[PDB]
Every structure is written in C-alpha cells, then in structure tokens.
Amino acid sequence: DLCEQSALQCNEQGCHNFCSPEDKPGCLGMVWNPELCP
C-alpha cells in the first residue's frame, strides 16, 4: 500500500508519512541504503 510503495518507489517522505513509526526504519532505513536506492 502507500507504505510499501514508499519503500518500493524510494520515497523517504512516504516512509515517514504513510508508513507507521514501526515500519518507518524498515522503510526509510532501507530506502536510505544506497544498495537499494542510490
């Protein structure tokens, strides 16, 4: 959903805005990894 989408499409904003505080690190912390989204 919007949360997953923020991981998949590399959206820091969404990773804070759409994802919950639990998924937040899971999403953003993952997205911020240049191995996935440089």
PDB file of N, CA and C in Angstrom:
ATOM      1  N   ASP A   1       0.858  -1.194   0.000  1.00  0.00           N
ATOM      2  CA  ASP A   1       0.000   0.000   0.000  1.00  0.00           C
ATOM      3  C   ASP A   1       0.888   1.237   0.000  1.00  0.00           C
ATOM      4  N   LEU A   2       0.442   2.419   0.428  1.00  0.00           N
ATOM      5  CA  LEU A   2       1.227   3.649   0.396  1.00  0.00           C
ATOM      6  C   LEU A   2       2.576   3.443   1.104  1.00  0.00           C
ATOM      7  N   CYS A   3       2.547   2.722   2.224  1.00  0.00           N
ATOM      8  CA  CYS A   3       3.752   2.378   2.974  1.00  0.00           C
ATOM      9  C   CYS A   3       4.729   1.571   2.122  1.00  0.00           C
ATOM     10  N   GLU A   4       4.323   0.375   1.704  1.00  0.00           N
ATOM     11  CA  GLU A   4       5.124  -0.457   0.804  1.00  0.00           C
ATOM     12  C   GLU A   4       5.623   0.383  -0.375  1.00  0.00           C
ATOM     13  N   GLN A   5       4.707   1.092  -1.039  1.00  0.00           N
ATOM     14  CA  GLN A   5       5.037   1.960  -2.151  1.00  0.00           C
ATOM     15  C   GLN A   5       6.183   2.900  -1.798  1.00  0.00           C
ATOM     16  N   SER A   6       6.186   3.505  -0.610  1.00  0.00           N
ATOM     17  CA  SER A   6       7.298   4.360  -0.221  1.00  0.00           C
ATOM     18  C   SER A   6       8.633   3.624  -0.091  1.00  0.00           C
ATOM     19  N   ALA A   7       8.611   2.323   0.200  1.00  0.00           N
ATOM     20  CA  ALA A   7       9.818   1.512   0.177  1.00  0.00           C
ATOM     21  C   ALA A   7      10.221   1.210  -1.265  1.00  0.00           C
ATOM     22  N   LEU A   8       9.264   0.727  -2.047  1.00  0.00           N
ATOM     23  CA  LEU A   8       9.451   0.203  -3.383  1.00  0.00           C
ATOM     24  C   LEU A   8       9.854   1.316  -4.358  1.00  0.00           C
ATOM     25  N   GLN A   9       9.171   2.463  -4.305  1.00  0.00           N
ATOM     26  CA  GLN A   9       9.432   3.609  -5.160  1.00  0.00           C
ATOM     27  C   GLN A   9      10.468   4.548  -4.538  1.00  0.00           C
ATOM     28  N   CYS A  10      11.011   4.240  -3.351  1.00  0.00           N
ATOM     29  CA  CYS A  10      12.054   5.060  -2.744  1.00  0.00           C
ATOM     30  C   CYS A  10      11.544   6.472  -2.458  1.00  0.00           C
ATOM     31  N   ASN A  11      10.702   6.574  -1.433  1.00  0.00           N
ATOM     32  CA  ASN A  11      10.068   7.807  -1.014  1.00  0.00           C
ATOM     33  C   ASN A  11      10.266   7.967   0.491  1.00  0.00           C
ATOM     34  N   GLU A  12      11.382   8.583   0.887  1.00  0.00           N
ATOM     35  CA  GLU A  12      11.656   8.981   2.266  1.00  0.00           C
ATOM     36  C   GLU A  12      10.408   9.602   2.917  1.00  0.00           C
ATOM     37  N   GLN A  13       9.680  10.437   2.167  1.00  0.00           N
ATOM     38  CA  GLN A  13       8.576  11.214   2.701  1.00  0.00           C
ATOM     39  C   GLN A  13       7.525  10.223   3.147  1.00  0.00           C
ATOM     40  N   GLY A  14       7.097   9.417   2.191  1.00  0.00           N
ATOM     41  CA  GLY A  14       6.156   8.337   2.398  1.00  0.00           C
ATOM     42  C   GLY A  14       6.586   7.415   3.544  1.00  0.00           C
ATOM     43  N   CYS A  15       7.870   7.058   3.601  1.00  0.00           N
ATOM     44  CA  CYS A  15       8.404   6.249   4.693  1.00  0.00           C
ATOM     45  C   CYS A  15       8.196   6.869   6.083  1.00  0.00           C
ATOM     46  N   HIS A  16       8.043   8.189   6.189  1.00  0.00           N
ATOM     47  CA  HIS A  16       7.636   8.844   7.435  1.00  0.00           C
ATOM     48  C   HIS A  16       6.128   9.111   7.496  1.00  0.00           C
ATOM     49  N   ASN A  17       5.512   9.402   6.350  1.00  0.00           N
ATOM     50  CA  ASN A  17       4.182   9.994   6.262  1.00  0.00           C
ATOM     51  C   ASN A  17       3.119   8.902   6.177  1.00  0.00           C
ATOM     52  N   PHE A  18       3.364   7.931   5.296  1.00  0.00           N
ATOM     53  CA  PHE A  18       2.486   6.817   5.001  1.00  0.00           C
ATOM     54  C   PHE A  18       2.793   5.636   5.918  1.00  0.00           C
ATOM     55  N   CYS A  19       4.068   5.241   6.017  1.00  0.00           N
ATOM     56  CA  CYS A  19       4.436   4.131   6.893  1.00  0.00           C
ATOM     57  C   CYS A  19       4.248   4.529   8.353  1.00  0.00           C
ATOM     58  N   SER A  20       3.941   3.539   9.194  1.00  0.00           N
ATOM     59  CA  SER A  20       3.789   3.735  10.626  1.00  0.00           C
ATOM     60  C   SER A  20       5.173   3.985  11.237  1.00  0.00           C
ATOM     61  N   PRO A  21       5.270   4.434  12.498  1.00  0.00           N
ATOM     62  CA  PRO A  21       6.557   4.522  13.165  1.00  0.00           C
ATOM     63  C   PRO A  21       7.287   3.176  13.272  1.00  0.00           C
ATOM     64  N   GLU A  22       6.571   2.049  13.182  1.00  0.00           N
ATOM     65  CA  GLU A  22       7.194   0.728  13.284  1.00  0.00           C
ATOM     66  C   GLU A  22       7.867   0.411  11.956  1.00  0.00           C
ATOM     67  N   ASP A  23       7.140   0.626  10.857  1.00  0.00           N
ATOM     68  CA  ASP A  23       7.688   0.347   9.540  1.00  0.00           C
ATOM     69  C   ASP A  23       8.696   1.418   9.151  1.00  0.00           C
ATOM     70  N   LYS A  24       8.553   2.647   9.656  1.00  0.00           N
ATOM     71  CA  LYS A  24       9.446   3.776   9.410  1.00  0.00           C
ATOM     72  C   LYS A  24      10.919   3.381   9.196  1.00  0.00           C
ATOM     73  N   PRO A  25      11.653   2.818  10.173  1.00  0.00           N
ATOM     74  CA  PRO A  25      13.039   2.421   9.963  1.00  0.00           C
ATOM     75  C   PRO A  25      13.132   1.343   8.882  1.00  0.00           C
ATOM     76  N   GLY A  26      12.250   0.347   8.947  1.00  0.00           N
ATOM     77  CA  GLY A  26      12.144  -0.699   7.937  1.00  0.00           C
ATOM     78  C   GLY A  26      12.043  -0.134   6.515  1.00  0.00           C
ATOM     79  N   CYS A  27      11.328   0.978   6.348  1.00  0.00           N
ATOM     80  CA  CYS A  27      11.071   1.618   5.071  1.00  0.00           C
ATOM     81  C   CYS A  27      12.209   2.570   4.749  1.00  0.00           C
ATOM     82  N   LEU A  28      12.335   3.646   5.524  1.00  0.00           N
ATOM     83  CA  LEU A  28      13.291   4.713   5.276  1.00  0.00           C
ATOM     84  C   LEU A  28      14.685   4.189   5.441  1.00  0.00           C
ATOM     85  N   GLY A  29      14.971   3.580   6.579  1.00  0.00           N
ATOM     86  CA  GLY A  29      16.285   2.997   6.820  1.00  0.00           C
ATOM     87  C   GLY A  29      16.702   2.090   5.658  1.00  0.00           C
ATOM     88  N   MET A  30      15.754   1.341   5.080  1.00  0.00           N
ATOM     89  CA  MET A  30      16.040   0.544   3.893  1.00  0.00           C
ATOM     90  C   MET A  30      16.263   1.452   2.677  1.00  0.00           C
ATOM     91  N   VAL A  31      15.340   2.364   2.381  1.00  0.00           N
ATOM     92  CA  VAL A  31      15.431   3.269   1.240  1.00  0.00           C
ATOM     93  C   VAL A  31      16.754   4.049   1.253  1.00  0.00           C
ATOM     94  N   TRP A  32      17.136   4.594   2.410  1.00  0.00           N
ATOM     95  CA  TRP A  32      18.366   5.342   2.624  1.00  0.00           C
ATOM     96  C   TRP A  32      19.592   4.484   2.320  1.00  0.00           C
ATOM     97  N   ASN A  33      19.465   3.154   2.316  1.00  0.00           N
ATOM     98  CA  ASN A  33      20.562   2.291   1.929  1.00  0.00           C
ATOM     99  C   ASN A  33      20.843   2.467   0.426  1.00  0.00           C
ATOM    100  N   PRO A  34      22.012   3.012   0.045  1.00  0.00           N
ATOM    101  CA  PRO A  34      22.350   3.238  -1.352  1.00  0.00           C
ATOM    102  C   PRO A  34      22.420   1.935  -2.159  1.00  0.00           C
ATOM    103  N   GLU A  35      22.490   0.777  -1.488  1.00  0.00           N
ATOM    104  CA  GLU A  35      22.393  -0.524  -2.130  1.00  0.00           C
ATOM    105  C   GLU A  35      21.036  -0.726  -2.822  1.00  0.00           C
ATOM    106  N   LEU A  36      19.955  -0.103  -2.335  1.00  0.00           N
ATOM    107  CA  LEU A  36      18.637  -0.223  -2.958  1.00  0.00           C
ATOM    108  C   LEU A  36      18.301   1.018  -3.785  1.00  0.00           C
ATOM    109  N   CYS A  37      18.345   2.196  -3.163  1.00  0.00           N
ATOM    110  CA  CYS A  37      18.044   3.463  -3.828  1.00  0.00           C
ATOM    111  C   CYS A  37      19.227   4.425  -3.693  1.00  0.00           C
ATOM    112  N   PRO A  38      20.097   4.514  -4.707  1.00  0.00           N
ATOM    113  CA  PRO A  38      21.258   5.386  -4.681  1.00  0.00           C
ATOM    114  C   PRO A  38      20.853   6.831  -4.990  1.00  0.00           C
TER     115      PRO A  38
END
